[PDB]
Assembly symmetry: C2
């Protein structure tokens, strides 16, 4: 009966509601973190951590740029006992820096330009998204999201990444104000 | 039957979903506007306009501060044929500047400190919210929301105002970067 296709539509709304709330929650935390810090360095790990929890990553790295080189300045989170930063050796990151575009590798085994990279293999990284962090046209850094399984991002998750990163860029650019 | 108390809960979820989407939408527009501008002055009206549409105001004013004086620098929106800025003569605004707190006057006729003010009367303003716009502890300006009817803000609407304003403060502080 059409009263069973109402369980199909409440179960649908609630999931959408759940999703929308989780989006709001990430944006809320990013604003809070920005307001509570007093320097750029204090803000980095908290931001990485915020993305890590939102996207259930194995690891997240937020790394600053000087021109088009990765800075030593960075913040990070990992479920592992150590964070292994090999982004300077990463084709995916290198394409992000060059093109100013989000780069999505949903399944490493399939990008042949990525499948044979020792670092992806030894860290067990099977999906990777890297997004430049750009304020106006100034690229301030990159944010890397890493998982040990292949992912399949929804439309809403990609919108959230685009907006998130954009907010983060507003955030970093203000943090440099003494 | 309990199948009629499922229409009561889908009609409930959808409204909550509607609300959450409208929140996301305001935050999205504020980020976009910040990224698309190239100066602080270009950003002001768009931000005021964004709040005006979100909160269905009669008018919105976003006005910069120098120390604790209102600047000439400002942006605004109004349904009226003219924007009448009388915030320098406003006790509500003056309390916001002094206390760094949101000020809510849901029904002017009832604040006796506000009911006899010529400007509230002649503009037909029956409710008024003014929120300082503060980055870290630096108060950059005030944002004023004005209606011709009494309002009754929901919990979610107040959270949105707090976060919004906080984002705007991040936004203005970055805009000053040449």
């Amino acid at each position: 009966q059409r009263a069973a296709e109402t369980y199909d539509l409440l179960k649908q709304r609630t999931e959408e509601l759940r999703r929308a709330n989780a989006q709001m929650s990430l944006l809320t935390v990013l604003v809070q973190v920005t307001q509570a810090s007093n320097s750029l360095e204090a803000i980095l790990t908290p931001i990485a951590t915020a993305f890590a929890e939102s996207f259930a990553v194995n690891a997240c790295i937020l790394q600053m740029l000087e021109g088009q080189t990765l800075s030593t300045i960075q913040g990070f989170y990992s479920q592992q006992g150590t964070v292994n930063n090999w982004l300077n050796q990463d084709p995916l990151t290198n394409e992000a820096i060059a093109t100013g575009q989000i780069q999505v590798a949903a399944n490493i085994a399939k990008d042949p330009k990525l499948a044979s990279i020792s670092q992806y293999q030894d860290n067990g990284i099977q999906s990777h998204v890297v997004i430049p962090i750009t304020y106006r046209n100034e690229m301030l850094g990159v944010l890397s999201l890493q998982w040990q399984q292949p992912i399949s991002l929804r439309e809403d998750e990609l919108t959230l990444i685009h907006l998130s990163a954009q907010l983060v860029a507003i955030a970093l650019t203000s943090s440099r104000c003494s």
